[PDB]
Amino acid sequence: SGIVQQQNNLLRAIEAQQHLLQLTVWGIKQLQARILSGGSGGWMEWDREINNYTSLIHSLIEESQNQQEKNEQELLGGSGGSGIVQQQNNLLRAIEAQQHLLQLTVWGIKQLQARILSGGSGGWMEWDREINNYTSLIHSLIEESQNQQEKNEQELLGGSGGSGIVQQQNNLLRAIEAQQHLLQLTVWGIKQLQARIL
C-alpha cells in the first residue's frame, strides 16, 4: 500500500494539469477574440463544452479527494483493497475527462492556426505529428487501463492481493505522462499564435 500514497501524487498531478489546462483555455480565448466573432465555426459550442467538462472534472476531483481521505483512514484496519480499486476507477475517469479537454483545446488551436499561419512550417508539421501520436498513445493507455480495471474488479472476489493493482498504477501514471506531453504541445502552439498577433 505505498499505493495509497502514490494515488495521492497521481491525483495531485491531475489537479496540477487541470490548472494548466485552464491557463491554455484562457490563452485560446484571447487569441480567438482577436481572430474571430464567436457565433460560427463551432465556437459557441466549444465554449459550452469546455464548461461542461470543466464542471465534470471538478466533480471527479472532489469525489477523488474524498475517496482518498477515506483510504488514508483505513490503512491499519484491513478490509481495504476495495477503496484502492475504487480510487483507480476515479483517477482513470479524471484522466478521460481531461482528455476530452485537451482534444477541445487542440481543436481550438488548429482552427486558429489554419486562419493565420501556413501549416507547412517544419515546427507545425512536427507539432501535428506529435499531437496525432500522443493522442493515439493516450487512447491506447486509456483502453488498456479500462481493460485492467475490469480485471482488477473481477479479481477482487478472491484475489488476496494483486500485481493487477500495481500494473494499473503504472497505466494511470503513463497516461498522465502522455497528457503532459500533449499539454506541452498545446502551450507551444499558443505561444506561436500569440507571437504572430499579440
Added chain:
Amino acid sequence: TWEXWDXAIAEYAXRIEXLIXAAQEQQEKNEXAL
C-alpha cells in the same frame, strides 16, 4: 500578463514534472514488492 501566464505555466509544468519524480521513483518501490 502573457510573460505572468508564461511564470505560472513553466512553474505548474515544476510541480508536475516533481510529482511525476515521486510517482516514478514509488513505481520503481512498487515494482521491489512485485
